[PDB]
Design an enzyme around this catalytic site. Structure first.
Site, PDB file in Angstrom:
ATOM      1  N   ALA B  12     162.051-121.422  53.283  1.00 34.53           N
ATOM      2  CA  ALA B  12     160.762-121.234  53.940  1.00 34.53           C
ATOM      3  C   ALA B  12     159.614-121.524  52.978  1.00 34.53           C
ATOM      4  O   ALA B  12     158.656-122.230  53.330  1.00 34.53           O
ATOM      5  CB  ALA B  12     160.663-119.827  54.526  1.00 34.53           C
ATOM      6  N   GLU B 254     139.169-111.608  43.282  1.00 31.58           N
ATOM      7  CA  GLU B 254     138.233-111.293  44.350  1.00 31.58           C
ATOM      8  C   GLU B 254     138.939-110.998  45.669  1.00 31.58           C
ATOM      9  O   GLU B 254     138.421-110.209  46.474  1.00 31.58           O
ATOM     10  CB  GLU B 254     137.232-112.437  44.517  1.00 31.58           C
ATOM     11  CG  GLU B 254     136.257-112.559  43.358  1.00 31.58           C
ATOM     12  CD  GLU B 254     135.153-113.548  43.642  1.00 31.58           C
ATOM     13  OE1 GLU B 254     135.024-113.946  44.821  1.00 31.58           O
ATOM     14  OE2 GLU B 254     134.386-113.889  42.704  1.00 31.58           O
TER      15      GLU B 254
HETATM   16  N1  LIG Z   1     157.917-120.490  59.393  1.00 30.47           N
HETATM   17  C1  LIG Z   1     159.003-120.962  58.786  1.00 30.47           C
HETATM   18  N2  LIG Z   1     160.088-120.141  58.678  1.00 30.47           N
HETATM   19  C2  LIG Z   1     161.182-120.612  58.068  1.00 30.47           C
HETATM   20  C3  LIG Z   1     161.254-121.890  57.546  1.00 30.47           C
HETATM   21  N3  LIG Z   1     162.483-122.052  57.010  1.00 30.47           N
HETATM   22  C4  LIG Z   1     163.169-120.896  57.175  1.00 30.47           C
HETATM   23  N4  LIG Z   1     162.375-120.018  57.856  1.00 30.47           N
HETATM   24  C5  LIG Z   1     162.628-118.614  58.219  1.00 30.47           C
HETATM   25  O1  LIG Z   1     163.003-117.953  57.020  1.00 30.47           O
HETATM   26  C6  LIG Z   1     164.000-116.996  57.270  1.00 30.47           C
HETATM   27  C7  LIG Z   1     165.237-117.335  56.454  1.00 30.47           C
HETATM   28  O2  LIG Z   1     164.866-117.609  55.132  1.00 30.47           O
HETATM   29  P1  LIG Z   1     165.223-118.958  54.346  1.00 30.47           P
HETATM   30  O3  LIG Z   1     164.037-119.585  53.660  1.00 30.47           O
HETATM   31  O4  LIG Z   1     165.863-119.954  55.265  1.00 30.47           O
HETATM   32  O5  LIG Z   1     166.235-118.326  53.261  1.00 30.47           O
HETATM   33  P2  LIG Z   1     166.417-118.736  51.702  1.00 30.47           P
HETATM   34  O6  LIG Z   1     165.357-118.199  50.794  1.00 30.47           O
HETATM   35  O7  LIG Z   1     166.617-120.219  51.540  1.00 30.47           O
HETATM   36  O8  LIG Z   1     167.750-117.925  51.287  1.00 30.47           O
HETATM   37  P3  LIG Z   1     169.248-118.544  51.357  1.00 30.47           P
HETATM   38  O9  LIG Z   1     169.372-119.810  52.215  1.00 30.47           O
HETATM   39  O10 LIG Z   1     170.074-117.407  51.884  1.00 30.47           O
HETATM   40  O11 LIG Z   1     169.606-118.874  49.930  1.00 30.47           O
HETATM   41  C8  LIG Z   1     164.295-117.032  58.753  1.00 30.47           C
HETATM   42  O12 LIG Z   1     163.694-115.899  59.346  1.00 30.47           O
HETATM   43  C9  LIG Z   1     163.693-118.331  59.253  1.00 30.47           C
HETATM   44  O13 LIG Z   1     163.090-118.138  60.510  1.00 30.47           O
HETATM   45  C10 LIG Z   1     160.161-122.736  57.637  1.00 30.47           C
HETATM   46  O14 LIG Z   1     160.226-123.888  57.165  1.00 30.47           O
HETATM   47  N5  LIG Z   1     159.032-122.246  58.273  1.00 30.47           N
END
Ligand SMILES: Nc1nc2c(ncn2[C@@H]2O[C@H](COP(=O)(O)OP(=O)(O)OP(=O)(O)O)[C@@H](O)[C@H]2O)c(=O)[nH]1
Ligand SMILES: COc1cc([C@@H]2c3cc4c(cc3[C@@H](Nc3ccc5ncccc5c3)[C@H]3COC(=O)[C@H]23)OCO4)cc(OC)c1OC
Ligand SMILES: Nc1ncnc2c1ncn2[C@@H]1O[C@H](COP(=O)(O)OP(=O)(O)CP(=O)(O)O)[C@@H](O)[C@H]1O
Ligand SMILES: Nc1nc2c(ncn2[C@@H]2O[C@H](COP(=O)(O)OP(=O)(O)O)[C@@H](O)[C@H]2O)c(=O)[nH]1
Ligand SMILES: [Ca+2]
Ligand SMILES: [Mg+2]
Ligand SMILES: [Mg+2]
Lengths: 313, 434, 52, 423
Positions: B12, B254
Site C-alpha cells: 500500500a 507546524e
Molecule cells: N488504498 C490502497 N490500499 C491498498 C493498496 N495495496 C494494498 N492495500 C490495502 O492494504 C492492506 C494490506 O496491506 P498490504 O500493503 O497489501 O500489505 P504489506 O505491507 O505488503 O504486507 P505483506 O504483503 O503481508 O508483506 C489491505 O487492507 C488492502 O486493502 C493500495 O495500493 N491502495
C-alpha cells in the site's frame, strides 16, 4: 428477503413491528449480534451508531435518531428551547435547570403575588430546592366535565429517513379520575399513577372521537381548530429545530424514529408542551394500526416488498 | 530550506508512494527522466521544491524517497515503470519473502533481518540533508509489512533521529477493497507500538475512498490505481505547503502545532472536495467549503456533528481569495453543527495556493478551478477506532489466529497490552469529546 | 469575525480566522532477540518431537 | 516466495497428480514437450511457481512402491514432460497396508525421495513449501505419503505443507482396511500439514451419478472432477492478480486454530468429460455454495463456515460477482460464525479453465467437515472393536496401541470441530 435484528426486548411497539415484518414472509430475523442486517431495532441506551453503515452491499436502517436525546431528556429540552434562535417560545412553560435566575423570576411573582406554584409540586421555593428542572406549574388547566378532571394529550409522531414528519391521526387523552384540587392523583395524569380509576372512560383513556364530541358539545369548537393546529405547530418547531444536528440525509446509514409528544391544554384552549418521549409505548387499542404504519412509511419506503397527517414533505 | 524524507513501506505504501511522486513531478514540471527545465539553478538550489527533490550535476531531480517491501513484485514495478529513471537503485529495497499478512512476522522474524539495511539506506539520504526536518511514512494498517515492519522502523527512527518529526499516512482496512482476515489484529498491534513515535497521522479509510470512487467518479469496481490516484491528490493537498512558497504548515513541526494539542490524539480527519468525473459545472468557494462538512467527502467515515473539534485547517488550491473563504465560513457556521472543545479557540487556519490542482492526464479526475482539503482534529474519528477495536474483540475472545503470531516469537500478552492501549485511547477521546 | 496573520506571496496566501475565543536501541534489541529465542525454543521442541 | 515443490505418491496420488499437470499445463500454454505455445502474457508471469525452466519442466516428484502407475505416466501424453530423475519407484508395493508404506517398505525408499526433494529445493529462489497428492485408503500414498510429510517437515520446518488427500468411501472402495489406513493418516495430517483439501471419493461419486448422470462412473470420471478442483484452488497461486496469493498467506487467512485445517473444495459449473451456454454470475454463485457441488460429502448446513475463499474465472462483471457473493452471505448469515468478521473473500482471474467461459471455485473451512471424520471414525470402530484385519498391521511391527491413539485423536478432532460449531 430482507434481514433484521432485535436489540430492545422491552419495546412493545417494535415487538409488534417485528411480529408484522416476519408476517410478510419477506423479512428474516437474525441473532442479536449479526452485523449483516438491513434493519436494526436497536437498544434504548448506548446504541452503537458508529458501527452502522459499514457493511459492503447492505443498506442499513435503524429506528433511532442519534442526537434525538437533546429533545427527549428534560434538562436537554429546556436547554435546547432556551438557546435555539428558532425556538427563543409561547408554548413551553417557564423552566430552569438546577443541579438563581429561578429565584429572580420567582420574586417577580411574589411581587404581584400571582400564581407562584412550580414543579420538580410545591408552592414555596426552598421546599423544592431542598427536595432536575423547575417548571412553572399550570394552575389553570382545562378540566373535563363531568368530573372536574385533569388530562394530558399524547401525540405519536413518526420521522422517516427523508425527515418527513408524520403525526398519527389517533392521539390519546390520559385523564385523571379524582377531580382537580386547586395529594397528586388528580395532579399527575400518568396511566400507572391512577391505578376511582376507570370510572368515566375505560382505562383513564379518552380517544379523539369523543374528546372532539365533548369539545363540540361543551365549548362549541373542534379538536382540530382549538388544539390540533397548536400541536402540529409545536411538533414541527421542535423537530425542524434539531433537523441539521440529527438528519441522516447524506449519511452512510439512515434513521427513522417514533416520538411521543406530551401536551397540556389550559382553560383558554392554549396548548403547552410538557415533554418529548423518545421510546414511547402505544395505547392498546391503537397498537395494531400504528405499528403497521411504521412498517408502511418508515421501513418499506427503504425496503419495498394514510393513518398519518403530513406535517412535512 | 529543510528537507523531508519519504518512506514507503509495503504494498500500500509503495503503490501510493508511486502515485504521489508521479503527481509531485507533474505539479513541479519534473519530467520522468528527472529533468526540470524551469530550475535555472543546475546541480543545486534551496527552493521550496528542494524539500522533496535533490539535484544532480546533470540536472536530475531525485526524490528524497525510500521504498521498502519485504517482497519484490511491487517495487520491481517501480524499477521498470515509467518513472524508473527518477529513483536511485539504493532507494528501492526488497526482501525475498513477505510477512504473510502477519504483524509478528513483519515486526519480529523478518524485520530483524532487514532493519539495519533500511536504516543505512535512509542514512545515505539524511547525510545529503543540510537540515533534515523528518519523515513522511506511507503504509497500511493491515499488511504484515505495512504494520509490523513500519512500527519497528518507527521505533528505530525515534532512536536514530530523536529530534526529528514523523508524520504517517495510514491505509485503514476496509473489506470492500481486500482485507486479510487478521487485519484488525495487525491494525491494533501497529497502532499500539507506533503511538509513542508518531507526531501526526492521517488515516485514510479504504471504504471512504472506494465509495467516493463509485459515487463521484462512476467507477463500478474501483482498482488500486483508481484508489491511489485519488489518495495521492489528497496527499498532495496535505504536503503542498512543504513543497511551495507559503506561510501555513511549512515544516513538519507546524502540523503538530496546528492540529495536535494533545499528543496521543494525533489523527486529524481529512475532507476533500470537489471530486468530479473526468468523463462527466464549476463549484464555488462556498460550495467546496460546505462540502468539507458532508460526511461523504471525508477520508474516514464518521459523524463530526457528534464530536468536538480541537483544530481546523483549510488548505485551498486554485482560484480562491480570502474574501470568499471568510464569507463561506460565516455562512456555514450559522447552518452546521460545529462545536469546538471549551479549551481551544473556535477558528480556522486557512492556506491558499493559487495553482489549481493537477491531475494525471487520462486519469479519472477532472481538472477543477478550485479545491479544498480540510484537516480537522475531531473526536468523531474515534468511531473508526471503536469499529476496529470491536472486530479485534470478536476474534480475540476465541483467540482465533493468535497462534500464527505466537508462532513467530510474539507473546500473547502483546495482544492485550495493545488492546488496553486502544481502550485508553478510546477514553481520551470520550473525555475530550463529551 | 476577526482575521489575523495575513501572509501574501506570489504563490498564494494564508491567514487565521477566529469566530469565538476559548525506548533505547538496547531495549528494542532485547525485544527482538527474545522473540527470536522463543522461535528457536519452539523449533527445538518440534525437532525433538520429530526425533521421537 | 515463489516456488512450490509438488509430490505425488501412490496409485491415486500419481493419477490425480498426472491429471493436474495435464490441466494446468494446458492453461499455462505448455505443450506435452515442455515448450510454451500460448498467446497471453498472464500465462508466463507466475509460471515459476510450478515450473522450472526454453522448455518448462514441472517441479514434480513422482513416488510409488510399485512401477505400474508411474509407467503409465511415462507412456502417456505428458509423461515426457516430467524430469526423468524425478521418478522414484520401488517394486514390492504396499499391499494397501499403511504400516508397509510408513514403516517397512516405504522406509526403504524414502531417502531416495528426499534426495530428489533436496535437489529441487536447492534450485529454488525462495521456496514456499510443498503440495502432496495422495489417497488416505491405500498404503503408498497413505503410509509412505505421511512418512514423507514428516521427513520433509524435519528438514524444512519453516515451509508450508499442503495436501490434496482423497478420503475413502465404501461406495468406491478397493479393500476393507481403508478406514484403518485413513484413520492412521488423518492423525499424521492433523499434526504435520498446514492445509489439506479433503477430496471425498463418496462425494465425487454422488456428483458423477446424481448430477452428471453417469450410471457407472470410473476413476477417470472422478479424476476429471479432482483435476478441475485442483486447478481452481491453485488459480490464485499461479496467475497474476490483485491478491497474488501463496501457500502461507492461505494458511494465515484460512486456519484460525492449528489443528482445524481441513478444507472442503467446491466447483461450478460441474461438468462431465457439452452445454454451450455459459453460466450467469448468479448461477455460478448459487451452485458453488450448494452441497451438491461440494467435493467432501458434508452438508455445510450442518455446521458453520469459519472462513471461505472464492475465486471467479472468466470475463464477467466484478460488480455482479461482489453483489452475488454478499447476497449468499445474507441468505445464510447463520452459517458464518460471528466471531470472525469479514470471513468470506473473493478473487477474480481473467483466464477461465479449458472448455468453460466462466467458472467458480470455493475453498471452505467449515465445521461440517466433522461429518466426514465421524464417518471414518465409525467405520474404524466397527472393525477395531473386534480387532478385525489387524494382523496385516501387527505383522509389520505395529502395536494395537497405535490404533487406539489414532482413533482418539480423530475423535478429539471431531469434538474440537463441534466446540466451534456451537461457539
Ligand atoms: N488504498 C490502497 N490500499 C491498498 C493498496 N495495496 C494494498 N492495500 C490495502 O492494504 C492492506 C494490506 O496491506 P498490504 O500493503 O497489501 O500489505 P504489506 O505491507 O505488503 O504486507 P505483506 O504483503 O503481508 O508483506 C489491505 O487492507 C488492502 O486493502 C493500495 O495500493 N491502495
Ligand atoms: C490460494 O488461493 C486463495 C487464497 C486466499 C487467502 C484468503 C483466505 C481467506 C480469507 C482471506 C484470504 C486473503 N486475504 C487477503 C486479501 C487481499 C489482500 N490484499 C492486500 C494484502 C493482503 C490481502 C489479504 C488471501 C491473501 O492471500 C491468500 O493466500 C489469502 O478469509 C477467509 O479465508 C484467498 C483466495 O480468494 C480470495 C484465494 O483464491 C481462491
Ligand atoms: N407545568 C405543569 N403544570 C401542570 N401539570 C404539570 C406540569 N408539568 C407536568 N405536569 C403534570 O405532571 C405529570 C407528570 O408527567 P410528565 O409529563 O411531567 O413526566 P413523565 O415522564 O412522568 C410522563 P411520560 O413518561 O408519559 O412522558 C403530567 O402528566 C402532568 O399532568
Ligand atoms: N478419486 C480417486 N480415488 C482413487 C484413485 N485410485 C485409488 N483411489 C482410492 O484410493 C484408495 C486406494 O489407494 P491407492 O492409491 O490405490 O493405494 P496406494 O497406491 O498404495 O497409495 C481407495 O480409497 C480408492 O478408492 C483415483 O484415481 N481417483
Ligand atoms: Ca535548483
Ligand atoms: Mg506485499
Ligand atoms: Mg490401489
Amino acid at each position: 428477503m430482507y434481514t433484521f435484528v432485535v436489540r430492545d426486548e422491552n419495546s412493545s411497539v417494535y415487538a409488534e413491528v417485528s411480529r408484522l415484518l416476519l408476517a410478510t414472509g419477506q423479512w428474516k430475523r437474525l441473532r442479536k449480534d449479526n452485523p449483516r442486517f438491513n434493519l436494526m431495532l436497536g437498544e434504548r441506551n448506548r446504541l452503537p451508531f458508529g458501527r452502522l453503515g459499514h457493511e459492503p452491499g447492505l443498506v442499513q436502517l435503524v429506528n433511532y435518531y442519534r442526537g434525538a436525546d437533546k429533545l427527549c431528556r428534560k434538562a436537554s429540552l429546556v436547554k435546547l428551547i432556551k438557546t435555539s434562535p428558532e425556538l427563543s417560545c409561547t408554548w413551553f412553560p417557564e423552566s430552569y435547570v438546577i443541579y438563581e435566575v429561578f429565584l429572580a423570576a420567582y420574586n417577580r411573582r411574589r411581587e404581584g403575588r400571582e400564581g407562584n406554584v412550580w414543579i420538580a409540586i410545591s408552592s414555596e421555593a426552598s421546599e423544592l430546592l431542598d427536595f432536575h428542572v423547575i417548571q412553572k406549574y399550570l394552575e389553570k388547566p382545562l378540566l373535563l366535565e363531568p368530573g372536574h378532571r385533569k388530562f394530558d394529550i399524547r401525540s405519536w409522531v413518526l420521522v422517516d429517513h427523508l425527515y418527513n414528519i408524520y403525526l398519527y391521526r389517533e392521539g390519546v387523552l390520559r385523564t385523571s379520575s379524582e377531580p382537580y384540587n386547586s395529594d397528586k392523583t388528580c395532579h399527575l395524569t400518568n396511566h400507572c399513577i391512577q391505578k376511582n380509576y376507570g370510572r368515566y372512560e375505560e382505562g383513564n383513556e379518552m380517544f379523539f372521537e369523543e374528546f372532539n364530541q365533548y369539545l363540540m358539545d361543551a365549548l362549541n369548537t373542534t379538536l382540530e381548530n382549538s388544539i390540533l393546529l397548536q400541536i402540529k405547530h409545536i411538533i414541527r418547531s421542535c423537530l425542524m429545530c434539531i433537523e441539521p444536528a440529527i438528519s441522516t440525509k447524506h449519511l452512510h446509514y439512515q434513521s427513522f424514529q417514533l416520538f411521543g409528544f406530551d401536551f397540556m391544554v389550559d382553560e383558554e384552549l392554549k396548548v403547552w408542551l410538557i415533554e418529548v418521549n423518545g421510546a414511547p409505548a402505544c395505547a392498546q387499542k391503537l397498537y395494531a394500526e400504528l405499528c403497521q404504519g411504521i412498517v408502511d412509511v418508515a421501513i418499506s419506503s427503504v425496503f419495498p416488498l394514510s393513518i398519518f397527517i403530513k406535517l412535512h414533505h | 530550506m529543510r528537507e523531508c524524507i519519504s518512506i514507503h513501506v509495503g504494498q500500500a505504501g509503495v503503490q501510493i508512494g508511486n502515485a504521489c511522486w508521479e503527481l509531485y513531478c507533474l505539479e513541479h514540471g519534473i519530467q520522468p527522466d528527472g529533468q526540470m527545465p524551469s530550475d535555472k539553478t543546475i546541480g543545486g538550489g534551496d527552493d521550496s521544491f528542494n524539500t522533496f527533490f535533490s539535484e544532480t550535476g546533470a540536472g536530475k531531480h531525485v526524490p528524497r524517497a525510500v521504498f521498502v517491501d519485504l517482497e519484490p513484485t511491487v517495487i520491481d514495478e517501480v524499477r521498470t515503470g515509467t518513472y524508473r529513471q527518477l529513483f536511485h537503485p539504493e532507494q528501492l529495497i526488497t526482501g525475498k519473502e513477505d510477512a504473510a499478512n502477519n504483524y509478528a512476522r513483519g515486526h519480529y522474524t523478518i524485520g530483524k533481518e532487514i532493519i539495519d539495511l533500511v536504516l543505512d539506506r535512509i542514512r545515505k539520504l539524511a547525510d545529503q540533508c543540510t537540515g533534515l526536518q523528518g519523515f513522511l511514512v506511507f503504509h497500511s494498517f493491515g499488511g504484515g509489512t505495512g504494520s509490523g515492519f513500519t512500527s519497528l522502523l518507527m521505533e528505530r527512527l525515534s532512536v536514530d533521529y530523536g529530534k526529528k518529526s514523523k508524520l504517517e499516512f495510514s491505509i485503514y482496512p476496509a473489506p470492500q477493497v481486500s482485507t486479510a482476515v487478521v487485519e484488525p489484529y495487525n491494525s491494533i498491534l501497529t497502532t499500539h507500538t507506533t503511538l509513542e513515535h508518531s507526531d501526526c497521522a492521517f488515516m485514510v479509510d479504504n471504504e471512504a475512498i472506494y465509495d467516493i470512487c463509485r459515487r463521484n467518479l462512476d467507477i463500478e469496481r474501483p482498482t488500486y490505481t483508481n484508489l491511489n490516484r485519488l489518495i495521492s491528490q489528497i496527499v498532495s493537498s496535505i504536503t503542498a505547503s512543504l513543497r511551495f512558497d507559503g506561510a501555513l504548515n511549512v515544516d513538519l513541526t507546524e502540523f503538530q502545532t496546528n492540529l495536535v494539542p494533545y499528543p496521543r490524539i494525533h489523527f486529524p480527519l481529512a475532507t476533500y472536495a470537489p471530486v468530479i468525473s473526468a468523463e462527466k459545472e464549476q463549484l464555488s468557494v462556498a460550495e467546496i467549503t460546505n462540502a468539507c462538512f458532508e460526511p461523504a467527502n471525508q477520508m474516514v467515515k464518521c459523524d463530526p456533528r457528534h464530536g468536538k473539534y480541537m483544530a481546523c485547517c483549510l488548505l485551498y488550491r486554485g482560484d480562491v481569495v480570502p474574501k470568499d473563504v471568510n464569507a463561506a465560513i460565516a455562512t456555514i457556521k450559522t447552518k452546521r453543527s460545529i462545536q469546538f472543545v471549551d479549551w481551544c479557540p473556535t477558528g480556522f487556519k486557512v492556506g491558499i495556493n493559487y495553482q489549481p490542482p493537477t491531475v494525471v492526464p487520462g486519469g479519472d479526475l477532472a481538472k477543477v478551478q478550485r479545491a479544498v482539503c480540510m484537516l480537522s482534529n475531531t473526536t468523531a474519528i474515534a468511531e473508526a477506532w471503536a469499529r476496529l477495536d470491536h472486530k479485534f474483540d470478536l476474534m480475540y475472545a476465541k483467540r482465533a489466529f493468535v497462534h500464527w503470531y505466537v508462532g513467530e516469537g510474539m507473546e500473547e500478552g502483546e495482544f492485550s497490552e495493545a488492546r488496553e492501549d486502544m481502550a485508553a485511547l478510546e477514553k481520551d477521546y470520550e473525555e475530550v469529546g463529551v | 469575525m476577526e482575521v489575523i496573520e495575513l501572509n501574501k506571496c506570489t504563490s498564494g496566501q494564508s491567514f487565521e480566522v477566529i469566530l469565538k475565543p476559548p525506548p533505547s536501541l538496547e531495549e528494542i534489541q532485547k525485544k527482538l532477540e527474545a522473540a527470536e529465542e522463543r522461535r528457536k525454543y519452539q523449533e527445538a521442541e518440534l525437532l525433538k518431537h520429530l526425533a521421537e | 516466495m515463489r516456488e512450490i515443490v509438488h509430490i505425488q505418491a501412490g496409485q491415486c496420488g500419481n493419477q490425480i497428480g498426472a491429471k493436474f499437470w495435464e490441466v494446468i499445463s494446458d492453461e499455462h500454454g505448455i505443450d506435452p514437450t515442455g515448450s510454451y505455445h500460448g498467446d497471453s502474457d498472464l500465462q508466463l508471469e507466475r509460471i515459476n511457481v510450478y515450473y522450472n525452466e526454453n522448455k518448462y519442466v514441472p517441479r514434480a516428484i513422482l513416488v510409488d512402491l510399485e512401477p505400474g502407475t508411474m509407467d503409465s505416466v511415462r507412456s502417456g501424453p505428458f509423461g515426457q514432460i516430467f524430469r526423468p530423475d524425478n521418478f522414484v519407484f520401488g517394486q514390492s508395493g504396499a499391499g494397501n497396508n499403511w504400516a508397509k508404506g510408513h514403516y517397512t517398505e516405504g522406509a526403504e525408499l524414502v531417502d531416495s525421495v528426499l534426495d530428489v526433494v533436496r535437489k529441487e529445493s536447492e534450485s529454488c529462489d525462495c521456496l514456499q513449501g510443498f503440495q502432496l497428492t495422495h489417497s488416505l485408503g491405500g498404503g503408498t500414498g497413505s503410509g509412505m505419503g505421511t512418512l514423507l510429510i514428516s521427513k520433509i517437515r524435519e528438514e524444512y520446518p519453516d515451509r508450508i505443507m499442503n495436501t490434496f488427500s482423497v478420503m475413502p468411501s465404501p461406495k468406491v472402495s478397493d479393500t476393507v482396511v481403508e478406514p484403518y489406513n485413513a484413520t492412521l493418516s488423518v492423525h499424521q495430517l492433523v499434526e504435520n500439514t498446514d492445509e489439506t483439501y479433503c477430496i471425498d471419493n463418496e462425494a465425487l461419486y454422488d456428483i458423477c451419478f446424481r448430477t452428471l448422470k453417469l450410471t457407472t462412473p470410473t476413476y477417470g470420471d472422478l479424476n476429471h472432477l479432482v483435476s478441475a478442483t485442483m486447478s481452481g484452488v491453485t488459480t490464485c497461486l499461479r496467475f497474476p492478480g490483485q491478491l497474488n496469493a501463496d501457500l502461507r498467506k492461505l494458511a494465515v487467512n484460512m486456519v484460525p486454530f492449528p489443528r482445524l485445517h481441513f478444507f472442503m473444495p467446491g466447483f461450478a459449473p460441474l461438468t462431465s468429460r457439452q452445454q454451450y451456454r455459459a453460466l450467469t454470475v448468479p448461477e455460478l454463485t448459487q451452485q458453488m455454495f450448494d452441497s451438491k457441488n461440494m467435493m467432501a460429502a458434508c452438508d455445510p448446513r450442518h455446521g458453520r463456515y469459519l472462513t471461505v475463499a472464492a475465486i471467479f474465472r472468466g470475463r464477467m462483471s466484478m460488480k455482479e460477482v461482489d453483489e452475488q457473493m454478499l447476497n449468499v452471505q445474507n441468505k445464510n448469515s447463520s452459517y458464518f460464525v460471528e466471531w470472525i468478521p469479514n470471513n468470506v473473500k473473493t478473487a477474480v482471474c481473467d483466464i477461465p479453465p479449458r472448455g468453460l467461459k466462466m467458472s467458480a471455485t470455493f475453498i471452505g473451512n467449515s465445521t461440517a467437515i466433522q461429518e466426514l471424520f465421524k464417518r471414518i471414525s465409525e467405520q474404524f470402530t466397527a472393525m477395531f472393536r473386534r480387532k478385525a484385519f489387524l494382523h496385516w498391521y501387527t505383522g509389520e511391527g505395529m502395536d494395537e496401541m497405535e490404533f487406539t491413539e489414532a482413533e482418539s485423536n480423530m475423535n478429539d478432532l471431531v469434538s474440537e470441530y463441534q466446540q466451534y460449531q456451537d461457539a
